[PDB]
Amino acid sequence: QIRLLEDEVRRKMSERNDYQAYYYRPSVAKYHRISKEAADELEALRGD
Amino acid sequence: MIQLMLYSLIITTSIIFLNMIHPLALGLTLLIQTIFVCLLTGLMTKSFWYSYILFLIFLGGMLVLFIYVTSLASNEMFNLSMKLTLFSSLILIFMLILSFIMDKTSSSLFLMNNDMQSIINMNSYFMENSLSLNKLYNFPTNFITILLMNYLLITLIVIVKITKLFK
Amino acid sequence: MFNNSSKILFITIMIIGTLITVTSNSWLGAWMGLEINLLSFIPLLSDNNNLMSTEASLKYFLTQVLASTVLLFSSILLMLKNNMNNEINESFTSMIIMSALLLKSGAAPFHFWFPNMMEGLTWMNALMLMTWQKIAPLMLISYLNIKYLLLISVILSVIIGAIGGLNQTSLRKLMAFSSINHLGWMLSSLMISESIWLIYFFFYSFLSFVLTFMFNIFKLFHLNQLFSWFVNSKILKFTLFMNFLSLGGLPPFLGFLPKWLVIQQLTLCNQYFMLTLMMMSTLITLFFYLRICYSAFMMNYFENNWIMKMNMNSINYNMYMIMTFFSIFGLFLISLFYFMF
Amino acid sequence: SLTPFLRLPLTDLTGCLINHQTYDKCGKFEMKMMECFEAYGLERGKRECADLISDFQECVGMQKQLMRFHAMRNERYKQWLKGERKGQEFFADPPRVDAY
Amino acid sequence: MFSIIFIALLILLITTIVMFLASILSKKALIDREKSSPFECGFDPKSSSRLPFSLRFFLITIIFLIFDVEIALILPMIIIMKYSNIMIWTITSIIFILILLIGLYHEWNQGMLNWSN
Amino acid sequence: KWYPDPEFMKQFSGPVMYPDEVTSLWTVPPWNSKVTPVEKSVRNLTLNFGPQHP
Amino acid sequence: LRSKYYDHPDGEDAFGKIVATNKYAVSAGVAWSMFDVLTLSKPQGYLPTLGRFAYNTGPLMGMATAFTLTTLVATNARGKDDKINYLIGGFAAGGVFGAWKHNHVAGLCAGLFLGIAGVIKKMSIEQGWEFFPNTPIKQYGGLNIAGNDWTIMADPPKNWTTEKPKE
Amino acid sequence: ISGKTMRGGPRVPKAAPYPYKTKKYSVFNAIFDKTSKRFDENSKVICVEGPIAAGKSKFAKELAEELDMEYYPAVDLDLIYINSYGYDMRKLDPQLPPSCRSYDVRNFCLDPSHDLAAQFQIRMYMLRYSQYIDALQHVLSTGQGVVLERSPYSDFVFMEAMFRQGYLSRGARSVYNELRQNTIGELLKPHLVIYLDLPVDAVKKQIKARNVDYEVQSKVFSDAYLSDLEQLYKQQYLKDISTHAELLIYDWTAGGETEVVVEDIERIDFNQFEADIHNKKMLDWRFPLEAEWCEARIKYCHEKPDLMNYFNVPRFDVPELVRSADDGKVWRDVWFNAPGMKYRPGYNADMGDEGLLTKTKIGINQGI
Amino acid sequence: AKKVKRDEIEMRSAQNVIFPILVAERDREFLRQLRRNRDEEAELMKNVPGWEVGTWYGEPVFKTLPEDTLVTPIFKEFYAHSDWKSYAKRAHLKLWS
Amino acid sequence: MIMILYWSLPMILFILGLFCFVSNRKHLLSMLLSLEFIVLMLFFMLFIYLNMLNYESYFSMMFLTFSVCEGALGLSILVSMIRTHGNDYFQSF
Amino acid sequence: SEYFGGQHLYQKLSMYSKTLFLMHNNSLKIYLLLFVFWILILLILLFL
């Protein structure tokens, strides 16, 4: 009975991909933020 | 006009490229192609910096290998055919007159040369390569250059491993 | 690490290059890693000692280079017309990227280079191309999500992959055909899911790794050599050769554990027809493996006379038949694997 | 950007390899998007970034805007071909060079 | 640029015209079987004379390419030095040159130019 | 008892175990699979240096 | 051109129906044709090459047309849509296979085989399942799939928050 | 290459010799220890040839004695029949008569009509060939020169010789002739070759002085057989060596004065031959870099099993070379049940080994 | 080098003084020209199936932008009713037409 | 159409390059030279994209550095191959 | 019965095994041409 439930939930959770689990594909803005920081670092630095 | 004429010259030389079979004739064809492509990318760029760069690496040094090892010569020189030249001239001209006909603007790229940027742009009033090549050296995107140089080092370790077959 | 010290160096650079691909964030970075793989592998493949190595090198280079050329090119188009690495949907922009990757890893319609390779390659060089030069293009195939092309690849990934194996008498070509069939299973498995695909490749790596690693040990290169290879007892001739059946993954050989995993999840996706076809061809794969095992199942054959003793490396043999023993009794470790849930 | 499966320390070289965002008008649109992709993953987000992807693409891609021009000028030529526009009316006035 | 382009085209046209002109100014002579032989110090040229391509000159030119590309990497240091962060620009550039020296000095101990042949 | 006999071992041992008009024709079984290169004659370049030469 | 064999009744729009099949017939025909002309036949010239392509394509047209018309004939006159209808459909297809192949036995046996194929195909069409249904699940890794990061750059805070609006 | 007499004393090894007898060589080890460092003047191979019964064993012994190389005794066919405790498997009677019963040079000389003779005819080449690798092992490890009385390179002389007599099969001649290529490609030719030249009659004089109940009374010793050595040595065997190795031919050992042979060899130097690398003579010894030295070194100190396994050649098209399965099965039963063969050497505790239950060691190229 | 930095900075200091005046006389022409440019886009597609000025047959080219958001037209659009002589006069000034 | 007017020329050249790469040539040099032309076109597509991008432009070097290495490897194996067989001619294949 | 399955299958398999060898007993130009064609088909279909 529990196994049948697990599959059903796994079916829903894959269809919608709501939850940050097996059927999830985490993205990353870290690298864009880092490049954002580098741009900030060097704008203020411009000009001697 | 220069841009589409330059397309036309590249098209004609490309037709030359696919016909020629003598290795020098092909290698010669690449040489012209490289000047043309350098010109063309330069036009649509912010400046010609990259054009000068890839010229001296690709053409200036690296096509020397291709011509040199393709100095096999076929054991004999070219039998040049004035016919493909005349067709080359013929195809060039009516492509060129069409270039005179084609829509002046819409037949042009849309990229933003330094001039085709707006006046207000405070960034554009710096040295043309300063802001473009900035992050090739500034962290955290500069280590990849370190990978390039070591890649080239390793490339030499490879060449001496392949080019050293018992002689 | 076969003869020289440079083997360690190029292997290292190769690893870094391929590791870039699997960890690559954008198509360009993945392309970068792929070419670095192209560099690092050519010198190992192109031994300067013999001839056949060198011809394999032009074919490998002349193929991979075009593959990388097309891959980056199709990347630009996709990541132009979509202006974004993850297109909204799979269109003609994307099938070309798979066709690049499928050739790079030697999939069904784009495989002919791959058998011709084996003639040149020595054993562990072949081995290393068998296992590791297929990670990066496959892990990228994961990112691409065109159902039908993978499906045609899976359909044709066993038909030729087994029919050819029936025909080959050079162990080099058989391993090629054996893997193309197995590659059929990975491709389907990756169409379904990735965690199971990761597992299945690993067991395939393990199995192919042990297999060719003994063939390297005894330098058995032709079915005749297998029948002729002296063993003191002609019993370990048979105990060692169970692994040839672990290729087919028949339950008491530990090759079943991955094939079971893929089958379970695949039918859970309900592509029952596809299972039938691959699994029909699996028998043909196992068929010529019995054709190999005529050398050992029966005992006390007709042999050559001059040989009196048979010898091999300590290190290779000591490592080899530990891996074999696992290929014998692997299943009871059913508990030890917890990555399937 | 397609997600590296392993996310090992060598994604640390090419992840910030080349960035849309910095010093780009489209970069503002990239942030409007990439935050959401972080919020909804890469599959629900790709579902629910309709406006974000549309404008982000339009800014850099210029597809919609540029093709609007191409039809716009073709239509000018088309009336000329039908003869509505003569030697004078065939073009408009020149913007002062110091503009744009 | 195209100001440069046109000038080069003009020069090249004037150049070919000059050489075209000299081709008519110079008197002709009836061709000779021997006047059009390769010059081998006055003794008959041997078989084809196409040189062997078993040699090192590609190897030297390959060293050229490696250093020629590396030169490309270090060209932009002139301009970015005013803009880039100084630690990164300092260390990053310094290790470029340092690795080059070590490659060179390690390679002298290798002495690869002093080939046996 | 029948044991695998040289006939059974000749079932295989062609370049194709079901030999055909072409595979049966040409055979290349170097057992070691490591065929040594055979040295060639690298004819050198000839220069009639002099007489017309400083 | 763009029609679906199996989206209409089993006895209507013969011409549209055959087209929706013939397209999936010609694809295989020419697909194999380019696959084998370069391997075995290798007939130098364009008419010889046209011959091989013609030799390969026509028979598969014969197979599809024979199957379609016989089975369409059944529903038109037999008045039912049964597994048996496709069975005679497959029998006709292989009868055409024997005719072209000039191998009486090979055609008949394949005609039985193709009848089995049509039988299963009808079973799919009528039992609401499919051979290659889309996936209901597509997994991307273990439960800690989010936790497999090993990167070493400090990430400044985000610009978005999961917390509810505070207006 | 230079005699102790001109040294006014003994020669010294330039560096500490590597224990290649008892230690394994690794690629890690190659990185950790250089190869040509030990190499010196005498690091070369002086092969000997002569018509049979030329007594060159004493010659080579003295030559290596007074030039400071290794003697490396001649073929020892018995070693197949010898084990960790010596005794002869020839002891095992014709229990398995047809193709399991032994065949030594005695049996050959008594009767070369037995097809089973072909066994040693090829196994004898292997013994030479295995010895040759032993010589290369000793060279590359110690840097000390070596002197092999006879070589696999020369073995085919006897091969074609026996076949011309008719003793070997047309099948066997093909087998050995093609099979040499397979392995013989993988050996370095000797630096110097010395061939000794008596006539057939003269060697018959000396072989009658050997007084060997399994040779002198035998019947093989026809002029044709003992002369085929002469022709084959003269042209077939010599020429290729004459291409690679430097060839000296004195009349023979008996008049062969060691000291003049010492002086003639020493006069023949090879620094003269350090000219253009592409020269085909000494070709197999031009090692560019220390790394390439180590490649050769590791290839012999760590791939002898690989060297042996080249011999694995399938040929069931020759009856005398095939073995009966069930008889061969019993032949396996005899050997590995016979005293001192159950386990690996050192683990035949049935025959005396102690220190077991903890011993787990195995020797570099230790037989099995 | 101090002297080189001295005069270059003076250029840059004189530089900043001038700049706003150029921007000021720049804005007026931009808005003037945009008025005209929209007028012609209206007056040239008078008879077109569904033309909607500043959009592509309905839906706006940009939507996330709030209302009364001015997006500078791409250079080509800004010259959508111009001849080459005008176009080149600004574009090909690096190249010196 | 955007691609037809802008990204079309790069396509036409790129496809022509590949066909010449799979044509018939006495040796492989024409092939290597063929793919070399393709690299220039590959650069052409790459640059027009990098030009869409304000500063990502610099990626030219990364592609160029990698591309020349392919050519060097290409010439490497060929030249070693003549030296091996005394020829690298397609008749040897 | 066995003709319908049995040995006849192994007979047809050998026929097709021979065929595949004929495919693979060719020059690398042919196979790359296949791939080029596959690319070319996809490219024009993007246009169409």
Ligand SMILES: Nc1nc2c(ncn2[C@H]2C[C@H](O)[C@@H](COP(=O)(O)OP(=O)(O)OP(=O)(O)O)O2)c(=O)[nH]1
């Ligand atoms: N079938 C065969 N017999 C060989 C071969 N080489 C040597 N023999 C046999 C012939 C001889 O009767 C016997 C060796 O006797 P020798 O003449 O070599 O004695 P020798 O005075 O030379 O001193 P030594 O043998 O070195 O102790 O072994 C071979 O290659 N094939």
